[PDB]
Each structure stands twice: as C-alpha cells, then as structure tokens.
Amino acid sequence: GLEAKKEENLADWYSQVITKSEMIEYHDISGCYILRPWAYAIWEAIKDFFDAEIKKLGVENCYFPMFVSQSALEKEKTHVADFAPEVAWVTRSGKTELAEPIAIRPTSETVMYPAYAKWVQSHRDLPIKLNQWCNVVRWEFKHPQPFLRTREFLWQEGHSAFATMEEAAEEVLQILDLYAQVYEELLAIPVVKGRKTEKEKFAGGDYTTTIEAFISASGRAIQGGTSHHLGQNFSKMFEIVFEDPKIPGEKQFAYQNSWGLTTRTIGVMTMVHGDNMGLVLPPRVACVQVVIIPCGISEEDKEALIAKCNDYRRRLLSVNIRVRADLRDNYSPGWKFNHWELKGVPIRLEVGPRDMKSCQFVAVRRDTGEKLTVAENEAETKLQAILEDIQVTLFTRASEDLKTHMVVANTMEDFQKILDSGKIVQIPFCGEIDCEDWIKKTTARDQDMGAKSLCIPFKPLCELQPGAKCVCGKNPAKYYTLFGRSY
Amino acid sequence: LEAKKEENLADWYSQVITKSEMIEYHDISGCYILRPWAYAIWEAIKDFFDAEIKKLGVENCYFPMFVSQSALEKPEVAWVTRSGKTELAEPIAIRPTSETVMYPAYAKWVQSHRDLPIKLNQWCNVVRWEFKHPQPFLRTREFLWQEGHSAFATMEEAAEEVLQILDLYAQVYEELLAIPVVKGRKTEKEKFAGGDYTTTIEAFISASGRAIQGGTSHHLGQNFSKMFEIVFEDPKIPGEKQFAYQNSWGLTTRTIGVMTMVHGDNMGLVLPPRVACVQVVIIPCSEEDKEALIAKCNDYRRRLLSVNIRVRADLRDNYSPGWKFNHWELKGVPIRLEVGPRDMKSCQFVAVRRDTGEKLTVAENEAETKLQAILEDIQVTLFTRASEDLKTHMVVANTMEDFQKILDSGKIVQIPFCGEIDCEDWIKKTTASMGAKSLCIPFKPLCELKCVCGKNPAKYYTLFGRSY
Ligand SMILES: Cc1cc(N2CC[C@@](C#N)(C3CC3)C2=O)cc(NC(=O)Cc2ccccc2)n1
Ligand SMILES: Cc1cc(N2CC[C@@](C#N)(C3CC3)C2=O)cc(NC(=O)Cc2ccccc2)n1
Ligand SMILES: O=C(C[C@H]1NCCC[C@@H]1O)Cn1cnc2cc(Br)c(Cl)cc2c1=O
C-alpha cells in the first residue's frame, strides 16, 4: 500500500505516489525523469484535446530543429541575460570539438522567427499559425521536481503572426481559454486567468496572460500555462515585414503571439487530487477509467466468471469507456484493488460468483471509496453516470479549496497575516516592479520566502474602489493583483 | 517547377521539397525545418503505426534525451559539455538511440517472469552528428522517429514480434506510401552488431538507381539482457535466473523522402491519397452567380467531409485560379476539383487527378462516389507504377560480370552469395563511383538457389546495390 501521508511529508508522499502509480522512473541525471506509460497516457489525452481545438482555430503542426546556432541565439534581444547560464551547449561530436558550439532549444523563437521572416513576403502570406509538440531543455541548478520543474520537459509551443493587432489579441485569449479548459474540464483543477504584472511577464513581449493554480498541500501557487501577445517586438527584431501597395513607403511589421503548455499539468493533477491511497485520475484523462476485477474466486464457475468480466469489458468498450480486465491468476484480489487504487483508476468493477448469479456487480468509486451494487442491465448507464459524477466531484472539491484559500486583503498587515496562513491573496496593487520587489522583500522579512505576484485577474473577487491605494501606500492602486508563495 | 527529375536530381529534389512547402533550410547544416505539409504526412504514418502497435500490446512512453557517459559506455555522438559558461561536472550525450537509457530501467522492472513482456515505444527525436553529406528527409543529423523496445520470456514470442513489426513497416511503405519494398535480413557484415539478426525493408529509387533502407526490426536475443542484467527467476528450477529475449525496431521521416523520390515528377510532389493532408482541393474558376458558385463549392466541401474525404475549399479572393492550380499541383494534392459557373449550371464538375493529369467530368450527384473511386485508383496507380519500376530494376545475375554490368545500368541485383564478410568487402571494392554493398537477404528471392567469388559456395541469394 501507500504508507506516506500527504499532510505529513508532502515531498516524500509525492515521490511515493509518482513511483508506486508507475508514472515516473528516476534517471541517473538530475532533473531528468522517465515518463512511463501511465503518465505518458495523460499527456496523450491532453494532446488529443488541445491539438483538435487549435486545429479548429487554423493552427497547423510542424517540427523545427532542436539546435540553435550561437549567432541565432545571441543575435536579437529575445531573452534576458539571466537565462544565459541555463542554456545547454553541445561543443563536440564524438571526440572532436565543433567549429561553433550549438545550443539546445530552451524555446524556439530564435529558430522559428528567421523562417517566418523568410516566409512573409506580402500581405497574403499572413497569418502564420504554427504549433509544435517537442522537448525543450533549461539547465537550471535549482532543485528539480518531477513534472513540476525539470531540466528536460515535453511541451507544446505555438507561434502565430498576423497582419493586425486585433486578430492576434483575439487568439491570445482563445488559447488561454483552451488552457483553462485543459485544467478545469480535463484535469478538474480550477485556475485563475489573468495578466502577468510588468515584473513577471515575458520581457520581450507586450503582455502575458496566464492561468494560475493553487496547491493547498504546500500552500503554494503554480503557473499552469501561458499565452503571450508579443505585439511587433519580435517582428521588428527579426524583420518579419510586408508592404501594402495601398500604403507605399511604410513597413508593416507582423503582430505576433506565442503560447505554451507542459507536462507540469500532470504534476498539478497529482498534487491537487492525490490522496493517502495514491494517485487519483480525473475520468477525462484516465488511461483506464474502469478496471474489472474478478473476486470471491469450482472449475467451471471460474470460466463463467471470467467470461462475465469480459462481457462487462466489451459492453464498456462499446460505449467508449476505457476499461481493463485484470484477469491475472498470480495476484490476489486485494493486491489488485491496491494496485489499481495506487494508480488512481476512477472505478473498480468487482465481479464475484454470487453477484454473477444474481446478475449484479459492485462498483467502487476511487475518489470517495463509496461502494454501489449495480444491476447488470444498467452497467453502461450507471457507470457513465458515475464517471461523470467523479469528474464533477473532483472539480467541486478543488474549487471549494481554492475558494477557502484565495481571499481579499487591502492592507500590508492583513495581507501578511493571510499569506502566512498558507493562502493566496488579492490585494490592491500599483503594478510597479520596484513595489513588487518590496512586497517580496518585506513579506519575507516579516513572515511568522517572500510572496510573488501570480497574476492580475481578469475577474477579481472585488472591484477596486476609486482612489484605493496600493498596499505600499505610496502610489494609487492600478488593479487587484493575486499574490502568493509560488513554485 | 523548372528543374527536371531526369537531369540533376539533387536540384529537382531541392526545388520539389521547398516549392511544395515541405522543407525549410536551417542555419545549421543537416538540420531541416519540417513545415506542416511534410509534418502532416508524418502524422498520418504515426496514426496508422500507433494504432497497429497498440493492438499488439505496445505502450507509449518518453525516456530522457540525455545519456550519461557511463551508461553510454557500457561514435558521432553530440556531447553537452556546459550550461551557459559553466562546464558540467561530466559531459552528457544526446541520444542517438535509447537502448542505453531504457534497458537499465528494464532490468529494474523485471524480477519475475510475470513482469514480462515489456513492450514500449516512443515517438521522439534522435541525433547522429555525422559530417557526411546530409539530405533532407533521407539522411539528417537530427530526425524524428519511433523506436520500439520489447522484452520477453522466450525467444519465440520475440521472433513473432520482429516479423509482425517488419510487416507493419512494409504496410507503411506499400499501403500508405504506395512504395514497394523488399523484405529480408541483413548479412553478417551489415546487421546490427548488438543483435542476433536484423530484418529490414529495402526500397529502390530509380532516378538515382540507388537503394535505401526504409525501416528495421532487430532480434537482439539475449545480447542486451546479458549486458544490462535483465533477468527473471526460472519458474521451474529454484535459484536459477534466465535472461530476457529482446527486440528493437525503428522507423523515421525518411519515409517522406522516399515518397518524394519515388512518386515525384516534373510538376512537383505527388501525394498518395492515403497520406495526403488534403485529398481534394476545390477551386472556383453576376453577384448572384458568384454567391451561388461559392455556395456550390461549399456544398461539395461539406459533402466530401461528410464522407470522410479530406477536402479543402480554396475560396480565397487574393489568388488567381491559375495560381491555385499551380500551388496545389506543386504540393501534390491528389485531386483538383474545378467548379466554374457553366459546370454549376450543368450539374457537373471537373476532377483533375494529379498523377496522370487526366481531367474527368463528373455529374454533381456522383461527387461523393466517383471521387472516392478516383482516390482509390490513384493510390493503386502509384503503387503499380512503382512496382513496375522495381521489377524492371531488380534482376538476377549469377556471375560477377553480369552483376557488374547490371549494376552499372542503374539496377540492383540478386546474386548467389556466400555470406562472408571478406567476400562482401571484395564485392564492394571490385564493383567500384561507389562499390555495391549488400542490401538484404530477401525472404522471397526471385529464383531458388556457388558464390560469385568462386572460392565459396552460395549460402543465399542476396540483394546488392549502390545504397544511400
Ligand atoms: C516541467 C516544467 C515546466 C516549466 N514551465 C515554465 C513555465 C511554464 C508554464 N506555465 C511554460 C510556459 C509553459 C511551465 O510549465 C518549467 C520547467 N523547468 C524549468 O523552469 C527549469 C528548471 C529546472 C530545474 C529546476 C528548476 C527549474 N519545467
Ligand atoms: C532521416 C534519417 C534516417 C536514418 N535512418 C538510419 C537507419 C534507419 C532506417 N531504416 C533507422 C532505423 C530507422 C533510418 O531511417 C538515418 C539518418 N541519419 C544518419 O544516419 C546520420 C547522418 C547524418 C548526415 C549524413 C549522414 C548520416 N537520417
Ligand atoms: O519561452 C519563453 C516564452 C514563450 N516561448 C514560446 C512558448 C511559451 C513560452 O512562454 C520564455 N523563456 C523561458 N525560459 C527561457 C530559458 C532560457 Br535558458 C532561454 Cl535562452 C530563454 C527562455 C525564454 O525565452
């Protein structure tokens, strides 16, 4: 069984859960982890959804090189200098030094935007809407954590270029809403949509929109996905331009966006829904939604029981429920109950001889442990209903927790008190970078780490009163901003 | 398209892959951008192969790209040596293939025979930093592939899988890409040194008279399980351990390059309907009649989508119809569906098939039926022509002189062969301006069976050729 308790040592519980659910295997290189099928399948579910949705918006998939030349990486002001010591450099092939070192992509702006500049020769060439599913590398020496913060990770990065600001601004919010759908509708995780402050936005962009999630077990928030409006900053840098004949003597620089989402998704799912029995899969992304286990197991009664289990399997498959029949003779029914509970399968379907003879079975929900006796004839109906109820239940519980842990404060003193209780706080804020630094410094100083901004919510809990001051007291508030201790 | 396939193939190829918007060049050599038109073909291959291996019980995963020095050493490898300006404690290698990352995990996952089989696949990128001359799709420094790695308790289930995977690869080439291939096994010289035997599919590119390996499926036997200690308890004998039997298999975007080299023509790319992102492109050729024509095009679009035909209506105002004809011809779209006002008012349309250029006039009410028929015929036609080509260019020669002569005509040859490494080296140096290498020992040779070296008897008919 799982013996680590989530409320006692969270980091050990997390390591136990991700390994005993067979999601993660550790590699011999720090910050690099093997995604076993149980975790990879969740990424595949997210991919299926998001891929279909961006195709509806006109985005097409592609694959750009993993390697960036020294010249291309350092040619334009695409990234702040603090990232320099975290680029992984290939310097030799076999035993002999390369003429010029080449970098592993940490993101693909510097490989994609020179090609965009080649491809945009007139108005007709826009828009360009490309996505790629790929791995990136950011070689930090801070402590890594499986799924949440790693050196190599899988993601998707979309990059779009448009003739007008309005088309681009529309896409930014559409993509952000798809990310919120990934978290809320697939993973049953509530998120807060907002704009990053000036300090936390992508430096080279116009503005950054974000979704923020809350991990109550650690009292910390974490960014779930991001959608940037780059404006014309990168088009001016890379000369992504066209000319209108109706406007002679003027360049038209493309308006650009970029957006990304990673396997961090899975880690947040694990941290939010996981419990002291192990992983808990939302039915929308569970590789296996129902596991059928023969229990209470004569020598032809046994064959009848096995055939009944396969009857349920085929009926469920027939109604698009993802189902596995664990018919292993080697393992005890208790062993199987435990194995699939650790893996978070939403429903265990128990079939024993007595129930078979009485044309019934037992369904056990993973989230609550509730057991239900179901008539055989209702199998497809009831189980679908139960799966839907599990999904809602998970979201509802997580939403309640966010509601208790995200609150309004209008003074530094109240903010400090609430923050130190392990919650995130919406405060009136002047938006200035220096003030944000001061908030981090003084909440660190006065705690009894510093708070960072998470986002400026699009829909704050309260509306800023006229003349309301920032918590710094010195400048008027520009907006309610969500702050907390962060991942 | 200006360049001609029959004169300057390399230039023809560069023009076709760029004007079809499949490839863009990168500022590092041997690395190429896969634009959507190319990537879509890879996605179609992936959809097929992924479904098929799932039916065999293979599960997808993702192992790390980085290999430690020690694990790798238990070679044109790209080495990471620093992060920023900070030298790493130890250099780490980019995977050229994932045996050395996967099999330590395999050895930890296998304790009893109940832990077998293990059947894992990953769709990923690998890196082989050679300085030989690269070619888009066909031979590149970084490439997308799938690598499957399986572990079993017995030799027999492993052997079964090797052959099933090779047949899936032959399905990818022959059924999806309309490319005939020759199944066989590699000679001692050419087989994977880390395995017991290597099965392969070989394809032929007549424009260069050269063969190319399309995919590969190895039986590794107990080589790697002895090296990495992938062991399980003997079910009958107390205390005794057995080593697992293993396979690995792989397939890359080389597929798309072979498809381009085989079916492409002097008008550009030619897509087999089974992998074409767009199978039919609808092109329009009084304000009321303008609106009605657009609506008719949209009718065809919706009807073809309703019958699961992949269709785009190019209703764009900012491009001439002739520009569209040429654009979608360069891209190899199998069928151009032309609707003009007169066609609309005659309840008919024109379908132009890309492979032959034939223009068919089709009654409107038959749109869904006939177009499906035409798509099927295009697929078959492509395959049939390619097979004709292969049969024309693969012949038996039972003596060296004829073999050399056959080879210099730009063909590949099945010869009686002894199998010895020394002899294969001698055939290479003799036939040299490259000398011929062995391609495979065909499962089904042209003729039933001494070597063409004389000094030895022939162990098998072997297919030899100048190879990519
Ligand atoms: C797994 C994962 C995810 C993400 N990030 C980033 C923001 C983002 C969001 N939202 C991306 C835009 C989509 C995200 O998920 C970032 C990372 N590694 C790193 O920072 C490097 C690293 C390595 C070791 C320790 C600490 C840090 N690792
Ligand atoms: C695109 C592609 C494909 C393949 N290979 C290999 C055999 C195989 C088959 N069949 C794999 C098992 C699946 C295949 O496709 C190999 C490659 N690059 C290389 O050798 C490196 C290289 C780079 C520049 C010049 C010369 C050589 N590049
Ligand atoms: O990667 C980004 C901005 C956006 N790029 C497209 C995908 C979504 C993503 O939010 C910001 N970023 C983040 N981390 C980086 C690390 C390094 Br090292 C470098 Cl060089 C550059 C960067 C860098 O540019």
Ligand SMILES: O=C(C[C@H]1NCCC[C@@H]1O)Cn1cnc2cc(Br)c(Cl)cc2c1=O
């Ligand atoms: O990669 C292979 C053997 C098989 N691995 C699984 C996928 C299918 C493939 O045929 C052979 N191979 C090929 N090229 C290599 C290049 C280098 Br560099 C290294 Cl270290 C190792 C290798 C190496 O092992």
Ligand SMILES: [Br-]
């Ligand atoms: Br980022």
Ligand SMILES: [Br-]
């Ligand atoms: Br290989």
Ligand SMILES: [Ca+2]
């Ligand atoms: Ca001006």
Ligand SMILES: [Ca+2]
């Ligand atoms: Ca709390």
Ligand SMILES: [Ca+2]
């Ligand atoms: Ca012994």
Ligand SMILES: [Cl-]
């Ligand atoms: Cl679902």
Ligand SMILES: [Cl-]
């Ligand atoms: Cl029934």
Ligand SMILES: [Zn+2]
């Ligand atoms: Zn799975």
Ligand SMILES: [Zn+2]
């Ligand atoms: Zn302030």
Ligand SMILES: [Zn+2]
């Ligand atoms: Zn496409």
Ligand SMILES: [Zn+2]
């Ligand atoms: Zn010989």
